[PDB]
Amino acid sequence: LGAKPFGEKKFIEIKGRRMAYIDEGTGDPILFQHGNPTSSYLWRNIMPHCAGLGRLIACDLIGMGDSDKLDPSGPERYAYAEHRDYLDALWEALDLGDRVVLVVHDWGSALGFDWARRHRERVQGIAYMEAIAMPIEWADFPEQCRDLFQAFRSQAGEELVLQDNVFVEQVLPGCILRPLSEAEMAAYREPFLAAGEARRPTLSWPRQIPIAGTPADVVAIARDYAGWLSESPIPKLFINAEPGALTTGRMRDFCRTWPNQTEITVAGAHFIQEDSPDEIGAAIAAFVRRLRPA
Ligand SMILES: [Cl-]
Ligand SMILES: [Mg+2]
Ligand SMILES: [Mg+2]
Ligand SMILES: [Mg+2]
């Protein structure tokens, strides 16, 4: 459980914007994708567990981490489709080959599940945790935060997030069981220090969650990857959490029906990487060991 980032940041130009990523080691990729409101930093205590098992890659989504901000920015910016445009292009640029192990969290799971559906022959295994595995209803959403996420989706969201930064300053530490040090919180705050559109990714993301049918485009995307994952023979590792947040109740029951799946449970709420990184890392390394027998 340490505060230092993992690896060296590297940069690739995508569509006029510089995108930042970690790419350590050699071999077939193990591709770790963060969601909201995090960055490659989320995985810093987990990626070392896979040392020597492949290329250890963690990309910063556009507008997040050390990847450039989009300008102009406004309520239309940083939707799922736009993130997928940038991330598809970066993943193409990284020359990943056809034995990718995906390790995904939160919106990283919506992006990674959809990429895997579209590139299924190229995916050797999928490890996922606190994921958006299917469209949901509000009743599925954690009770502790249902009102706040409704408010992000409303016109309240601009003040709450762009002015007050509540997703970074309150949702993120409130969905970690242990207290963060100032350096850890600073690494999460860093991309979003500035009021206004610098914080737009952390407001656009809750507006994309497929809940009660809207927004319809993301609902259709998640419908598609849910139906595909539930019948896919690709090896899976489900990293369950207690108490958990998002992958609980009926969604957790759904994920437990997926084929070719192993499971572990760790302590954590939503950003479980900060509570149990070594247990998560050890499960992923064992999974990759099995998929890549030495
Ligand atoms: Cl979100
Ligand atoms: Mg080094
Ligand atoms: Mg530039
Ligand atoms: Mg007021």
UniProtKB/Swiss-Prot annotation:
Entry keyword set: Detoxification, Hydrolase, Periplasm
Effect on the protein upon substituting residue 107 to L: Loss of activity
Induction entry: Constitutively expressed.
One function term, GO molecular function aspect: haloalkane dehalogenase activity
Effect ascribed to mutating residue 106 to N: 58% of wild-type activity
Reactions that this protein is recorded to catalyse: 1-haloalkane + H2O = a halide anion + a primary alcohol + H(+); (3R,6R)-1,3,4,6-tetrachlorocyclohexa-1,4-diene + 2 H2O = 2,5-dichlorocyclohexa-2,5-dien-1,4-diol + 2 chloride + 2 H(+)
Pathway in which this enzyme or protein is active: Xenobiotic degradation; gamma-hexachlorocyclohexane degradation
Coiled coil (UniProt feature): none
Cellular component terms (Gene Ontology): periplasmic space
Biological processes, Gene Ontology terms: response to toxic substance
Activity control, per UniProt: Competitively inhibited by the key pollutants 1,2-dichloroethane (1,2-DCE) and 1,2-dichloropropane (1,2-DCP).
InterPro entries for this protein: AB_hydrolase_1 (IPR000073), AB_hydrolase_fold (IPR029058), Epox_hydrolase-like (IPR000639), Haloalkane_dehalogenase_2 (IPR023594)
Nucleotide-binding as UniProt keyword: no
Residues noted as binding chloride in the record, renumbered to the chain: 36, 107
Active site: 106 (nucleophile), 130 (proton donor), 270 (proton acceptor)
Free-text function comment from the UniProt entry: Catalyzes hydrolytic cleavage of carbon-halogen bonds in halogenated aliphatic compounds, leading to the formation of the corresponding primary alcohols, halide ions and protons. Has a broad substrate specificity since not only monochloroalkanes (C3 to C10) but also dichloroalkanes (> C3), bromoalkanes, and chlorinated aliphatic alcohols are good substrates. Shows almost no activity with 1,2-dichloroethane, but very high activity with the brominated analog.
Comment field (misc): Is not N-terminally processed during export, so it may be secreted into the periplasmic space via a hitherto unknown mechanism.
Quaternary structure and interacting proteins, as annotated: Monomer.
Family: Belongs to the haloalkane dehalogenase family. Type 2 subfamily.
Protein known as: Haloalkane dehalogenase
Species of origin: Sphingobium indicum (strain DSM 16413 / CCM 7287 / MTCC 6362 / UT26 / NBRC 101211 / UT26S) (Sphingobium japonicum)
Lineage: Bacteria, Pseudomonadati, Pseudomonadota, Alphaproteobacteria, Sphingomonadales
Gene designation per UniProt: linB
